[PDB]
């Protein structure tokens, strides 16, 4: 809408008011990168026509959206200026991302954490680290949608990889800033016939990019690698491991079990009296409200709640690591194993009949809200 020549909008850096448009598209990154010779060639503004620039912007920025002809007129607003040269293809995907057709299939329907991971998949063509999420999740908290898409397009990572004339794509650069950052990029970017719309939870890179260890599974990276770079290893060896990561990646089998949350349970023969291993760690999940005459009391049975292994990390080890000065004055061995144990009567309150008392011995130590 603005001008027939516009390199940069919104005046974020000071040196874009004097910056020209790029007269030619930018070069490839200068490292070796053995994978990209098997890859198809990148599509730019000045080598290809508008039939395939629109398809690859749908194949990368829109994921695989299946935009119809009456669907997305906001993209048809933004595409009609790109064919007139009124904005570059760098600014065009800023107009695609800020549009509501990008919002009404990636922002409202996916989760809050998954919206950041799809933005690195579409705009930068990779998958972020945890520190890249934690700087991008505050823009969704304090500044909203429009400033968060400005963090990709006005970044220096975009302008060095694509510049003003190159459609976004999966850039294999060989020497990466982290060894995770290759194979988390590859796992985030599968090949053809995959979209983002069915996986309303993505749930697998949402927990590999969540904690900084637990790098993702090898068959989830041998799957979208290119060809004469996967073969003689995907006939039937890892192929059944694939056709599984696919019934689990599809329908979003939540990885509490095998990926993170890793608890050595006891064998089933060890208890056998608290039996029926479907049950075994189920509790009543009780909730009361007690407000007016609509307050309900929702007593559900809960699921097999696991020891969380971090609330047992903060406390019982980091917390309460006191246990000091335990010589406890060893004099006179009349005791037996119970040095000071009160009989501890504890009368269960005499509601006049059918209520009775039992007693138990226990070692007693005075608490810390006690004497002086």
């Amino acid at each position: 809408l603005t001008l027939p020549g516009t390199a940069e909008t919104n005046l974020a850096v000071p040196s874009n008011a004097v910056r020209k448009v790029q007269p030619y598209p930018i070069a490839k990154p200068p490292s070796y990168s053995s994978v990209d010779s098997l890859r198809p060639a990148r599509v730019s503004r000045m080598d290809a026509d508008w039939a395939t620039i629109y398809e690859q912007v749908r194949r990368q920025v829109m994921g695989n959206a299946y935009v119809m002809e009456g669907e997305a007129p906001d993209i048809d607003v933004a595409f009609s200026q790109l064919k007139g040269g009124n904005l570059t293809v760098r600014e065009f995907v800023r107009a695609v991302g800020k549009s509501a057709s990008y919002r009404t299939r990636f922002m409202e329907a996916k989760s809050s954490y998954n919206f950041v991971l799809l933005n690195f998949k579409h705009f930068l063509g990779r998958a972020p680290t945890q520190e890249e999420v934690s700087t991008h999740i505050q823009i969704l908290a304090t500044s909203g949608l429009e400033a968060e898409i400005d963090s990709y397009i006005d970044s220096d990572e975009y302008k060095a990889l694509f510049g003003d004339h190159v459609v976004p794509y999966v850039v294999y650069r060989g020497t990466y800033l982290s060894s995770e950052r290759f194979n988390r990029m590859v796992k985030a970017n599968p090949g053809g016939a995959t979209s983002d719309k069915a996986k309303s939870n993505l749930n697998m890179i949402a927990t590999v990019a969540a904690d900084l260890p637990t790098d993702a599974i090898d068959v989830m990276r041998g799957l979208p690698s290119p060809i004469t770079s996967e073969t003689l290893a995907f006939g039937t060896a890892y192929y059944w491991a694939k056709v599984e990561k696919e019934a689990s990646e599809g329908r979003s089998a939540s990885p509490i079990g095998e990926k993170i949350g890793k608890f050595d349970h006891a064998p089933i023969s060890t208890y056998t009296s608290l039996c029926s291993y479907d049950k075994v760690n189920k509790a009543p999940q009780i909730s009361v409200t007690n407000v007016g005459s609509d307050e309900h009391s929702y007593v559900s049975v809960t699921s097999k709640y696991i020891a969380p292994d971090m609330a047992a990390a903060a406390q019982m080890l980091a917390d309460c690591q006191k246990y000091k000065a335990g010589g406890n004055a060893p004099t006179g061995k009349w005791m037996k194993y119970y040095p000071g144990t009160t009989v501890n009567m504890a009368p269960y309150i005499s509601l006049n009949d059918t209520g009775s008392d039992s007693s138990r011995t226990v070692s007693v130590t005075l608490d810390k809200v006690k004497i002086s």
Partner: protein, 177 residues
Amino acid sequence: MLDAFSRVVVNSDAKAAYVGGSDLQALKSFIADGNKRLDAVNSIVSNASCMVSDAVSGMICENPGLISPGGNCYTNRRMAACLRDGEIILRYVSYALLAGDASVLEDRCLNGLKETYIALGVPTNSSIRAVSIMKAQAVAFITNTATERKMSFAAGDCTSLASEVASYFDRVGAAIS
């Protein structure tokens, strides 16, 4: 996503049925507490900053094991995360009080909250105690039984919305348990 108006169409879309006068009065009953719902959300976001800062510090003051080093809420960054982490729960429950059903926060906030807090290492038993303070103060405001802050209202019953927001806050707690 799905409000209270569009909840009765997707139940009727599976039957291919026209919405008629057998359940329109159930939807017309929802509009009759329109202003009763409308003041209730306004009383939530009135004291929303004082809501979450009393909730997280109350969770600290009963369980001081996170302020100890090695704890999850130890450093100054993670307390700024945790004051932000309970603020998103207040922000999305207030959407469900406005939409009338737990459908906006279910696929955006709760969808994948369980393994996010497990993988980062959030103590999930303390997150139950975090939002249970936010449950008991949300019913304290919309029944106006808050002692230190009393807001003027038109008199009447509002306990039907009090069971609404208390059915949302344990849906968050069940999604993180």
